[PDB]
Amino acid sequence: MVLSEGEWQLVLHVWAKVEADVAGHGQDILIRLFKSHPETLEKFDRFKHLKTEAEMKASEDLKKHGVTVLTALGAILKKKGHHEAELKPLAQSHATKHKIPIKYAEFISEAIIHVLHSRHPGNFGADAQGAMNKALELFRKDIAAKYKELGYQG
Ligand code: HEM
């Protein structure tokens, strides 16, 4: 798949807003994922112990990892489809080291869309959400293909 330039512009316009507060958005997205799909929390030996939303919100470590996640995702999105080098090390660590099944990438995709819709309603109308979804689908498709190449499947 290929996004058009107009779709990329909708994606990067809302992303510019996200980047005004990377830590806050990172926290919100990981917490949404762990509340909506509790099984994902189990893959994080670092965070597995957190029992409640209050505890997640107070963890400086979780916030730091949220920044790490969104910074890496932001770098991929800014490539506007030319992301093969950025994707390679991420595919390898998530497939071989962390052992994350590809279905969980769908779950975090959902979490990102939820938080952008909640925080940025005026810059995340239906057309902008559709463009963000296509971007995330492109990312998932390419990561799935690399999983296969690496011997995992997802
Ligand atoms: C937008 C998708 C994602 C991005 C951009 C992302 C990015 C990253 C980055 C940059 C790291 C640190 C370096 C590395 O280990 O590769 C990391 C670590 C990790 N990721 Fe992801 N990740 C994503 C989705 C997920 C999902 C869906 C899960 C699990 C449900 C996951 C599980 C982990 C784990 C367990 C670690 C190691 C944490 C630690 O113990 O420090 N990732 N991720």
UniProtKB/Swiss-Prot annotation:
Cellular-component GO terms for this entry: extracellular exosome; sarcoplasm
Gene Ontology MF: a single term: peroxidase activity
Enzyme class at the top of the EC tree: oxidoreductase
Record-listed O2 binding positions: H65
Catalytic activity field: Fe(III)-heme b-[protein] + nitric oxide + H2O = Fe(II)-heme b-[protein] + nitrite + 2 H(+); H2O2 + AH2 = A + 2 H2O
GO-annotated biological processes: removal of superoxide radicals
InterPro entries: Globin, Globin-like_sf, Myoglobin
Modified residues (Phosphoserine): S4
Assembly and oligomerization: Monomeric.
Protein name: Myoglobin
Source organism of the structure: Physeter macrocephalus
